[PDB]
């Protein structure tokens, strides 16, 4: 059964609610982004209207074979009417195609559903600036002050400089980047750009990236592994055994691997600066964990909410334990008292 925090009151609508069968009274199913915990349950047999971004729509049609007649793509930053209700999709600064959804209820209530997001001051000048929001359904993934991490730009600087140094010292080194979902494409595209290479990958991953409207993509990616010195591999294979095995397959073209695992937060964040990050090394293999996040830090989240001043907050992440829920509610109250709303 569908949990309450996936239902939008006063509407026929649900958000990211595809794993519960036919939801009673739902007339339109919104999908914020193509990540499996959110799309879980969609397939070619789905016959209700799905509302989403253009990019999410390309992925539904090509990867899950959802039929075209049930895919309803909406442009961003544009007022649209869905089953009698005005909605707007906003960029979520998450993965490609990820959106936040503004609903304008017929009684005058305005609701923002963030989906998954990385809050940014640039959001304070979107169509959110133009009216009051009463209820916020908030991505609280990292809602605790221990969660600090650098900007995406600092992380990419670290990765480009690390890769360019290693390959210039040893032109026979291979760079490998882990992946298991869409998102974080900048990691492998930035590194391939500094090295003058295309990114090589499986046919299935090439297909996925071809759905993303990224400019000049035919110029940056390929299925010909032999022509490429940046390879993408499943995240599970980014370990010493998996990488040793891959190096064997390259036919003596390379004699060293430098590999990157973009994680979210890890507790090495509480002690160490990005400058000071070091790899794990075994023989001719080194592995870097880099803290490239597509979710808000605690401070980014706090800034957004204190700017928005919602009347009520409904968390959508970490809702399963009483300790988590109590912790989150304490921070929301602090934020409200400090800012004065
Ligand atoms: Ni996500």
PDB file of N, CA, C and O and ligand atoms in Angstrom, residues 32-38 94-95 98 115-117 139 182 294-295, ligand 1:
ATOM      1  N   UNK A  32       9.566  11.707 -10.789  1.00  0.00           N
ATOM      2  CA  UNK A  32      10.527  12.834 -10.653  1.00  0.00           C
ATOM      3  C   UNK A  32      11.826  12.598 -11.449  1.00  0.00           C
ATOM      4  O   UNK A  32      12.372  13.542 -11.969  1.00  0.00           O
ATOM      5  N   UNK A  33      12.267  11.324 -11.521  1.00  0.00           N
ATOM      6  CA  UNK A  33      13.567  10.996 -12.174  1.00  0.00           C
ATOM      7  C   UNK A  33      13.692   9.491 -12.364  1.00  0.00           C
ATOM      8  O   UNK A  33      13.072   8.701 -11.631  1.00  0.00           O
ATOM      9  N   UNK A  34      14.569   9.112 -13.290  1.00  0.00           N
ATOM     10  CA  UNK A  34      14.850   7.688 -13.555  1.00  0.00           C
ATOM     11  C   UNK A  34      15.924   7.034 -12.657  1.00  0.00           C
ATOM     12  O   UNK A  34      17.048   6.669 -13.162  1.00  0.00           O
ATOM     13  N   UNK A  35      15.603   6.815 -11.371  1.00  0.00           N
ATOM     14  CA  UNK A  35      16.400   6.006 -10.440  1.00  0.00           C
ATOM     15  C   UNK A  35      15.496   4.872  -9.948  1.00  0.00           C
ATOM     16  O   UNK A  35      14.265   5.082  -9.680  1.00  0.00           O
ATOM     17  N   UNK A  36      16.079   3.661  -9.752  1.00  0.00           N
ATOM     18  CA  UNK A  36      15.209   2.475  -9.608  1.00  0.00           C
ATOM     19  C   UNK A  36      14.332   2.515  -8.343  1.00  0.00           C
ATOM     20  O   UNK A  36      13.191   2.041  -8.404  1.00  0.00           O
ATOM     21  N   UNK A  37      14.790   3.050  -7.223  1.00  0.00           N
ATOM     22  CA  UNK A  37      13.900   3.117  -6.032  1.00  0.00           C
ATOM     23  C   UNK A  37      12.658   3.977  -6.323  1.00  0.00           C
ATOM     24  O   UNK A  37      11.641   3.876  -5.596  1.00  0.00           O
ATOM     25  N   UNK A  38      12.753   4.875  -7.323  1.00  0.00           N
ATOM     26  CA  UNK A  38      11.627   5.758  -7.695  1.00  0.00           C
ATOM     27  C   UNK A  38      10.742   5.219  -8.807  1.00  0.00           C
ATOM     28  O   UNK A  38       9.504   5.336  -8.691  1.00  0.00           O
ATOM     29  N   UNK A  94      19.896  17.228  -9.732  1.00  0.00           N
ATOM     30  CA  UNK A  94      20.113  15.821  -9.306  1.00  0.00           C
ATOM     31  C   UNK A  94      20.782  15.162 -10.493  1.00  0.00           C
ATOM     32  O   UNK A  94      21.909  15.622 -10.822  1.00  0.00           O
ATOM     33  N   UNK A  95      20.215  14.106 -11.071  1.00  0.00           N
ATOM     34  CA  UNK A  95      20.722  13.450 -12.312  1.00  0.00           C
ATOM     35  C   UNK A  95      20.017  14.004 -13.543  1.00  0.00           C
ATOM     36  O   UNK A  95      19.051  14.786 -13.411  1.00  0.00           O
ATOM     37  N   UNK A  98      16.013  14.941 -13.927  1.00  0.00           N
ATOM     38  CA  UNK A  98      15.377  15.034 -12.583  1.00  0.00           C
ATOM     39  C   UNK A  98      14.698  16.360 -12.368  1.00  0.00           C
ATOM     40  O   UNK A  98      15.291  17.429 -12.690  1.00  0.00           O
ATOM     41  N   UNK A 115      11.344  15.916  -5.222  1.00  0.00           N
ATOM     42  CA  UNK A 115      11.900  14.650  -5.691  1.00  0.00           C
ATOM     43  C   UNK A 115      13.208  14.479  -4.919  1.00  0.00           C
ATOM     44  O   UNK A 115      13.334  14.834  -3.734  1.00  0.00           O
ATOM     45  N   UNK A 116      14.204  13.959  -5.613  1.00  0.00           N
ATOM     46  CA  UNK A 116      15.616  14.009  -5.120  1.00  0.00           C
ATOM     47  C   UNK A 116      16.277  15.297  -5.683  1.00  0.00           C
ATOM     48  O   UNK A 116      16.116  15.625  -6.843  1.00  0.00           O
ATOM     49  N   UNK A 117      16.993  16.015  -4.843  1.00  0.00           N
ATOM     50  CA  UNK A 117      17.577  17.359  -5.285  1.00  0.00           C
ATOM     51  C   UNK A 117      18.903  17.661  -4.564  1.00  0.00           C
ATOM     52  O   UNK A 117      19.146  17.148  -3.444  1.00  0.00           O
ATOM     53  N   UNK A 139      13.386  16.147   0.116  1.00  0.00           N
ATOM     54  CA  UNK A 139      14.497  15.147   0.112  1.00  0.00           C
ATOM     55  C   UNK A 139      15.451  15.435   1.258  1.00  0.00           C
ATOM     56  O   UNK A 139      16.253  16.350   1.251  1.00  0.00           O
ATOM     57  N   UNK A 182      22.108   6.304 -13.893  1.00  0.00           N
ATOM     58  CA  UNK A 182      22.371   7.634 -14.397  1.00  0.00           C
ATOM     59  C   UNK A 182      22.704   8.606 -13.235  1.00  0.00           C
ATOM     60  O   UNK A 182      22.442   8.285 -12.048  1.00  0.00           O
ATOM     61  N   UNK A 294      25.001  14.120  -5.504  1.00  0.00           N
ATOM     62  CA  UNK A 294      23.814  14.722  -6.175  1.00  0.00           C
ATOM     63  C   UNK A 294      22.622  14.979  -5.236  1.00  0.00           C
ATOM     64  O   UNK A 294      21.489  15.144  -5.667  1.00  0.00           O
ATOM     65  N   UNK A 295      22.895  14.979  -3.923  1.00  0.00           N
ATOM     66  CA  UNK A 295      21.945  15.425  -2.918  1.00  0.00           C
ATOM     67  C   UNK A 295      22.483  16.585  -2.079  1.00  0.00           C
ATOM     68  O   UNK A 295      23.725  16.789  -1.921  1.00  0.00           O
TER      69      UNK A 295
HETATM   70 NI1  LIG B   1      17.778   9.636  -6.966  1.00  0.00          NI
END
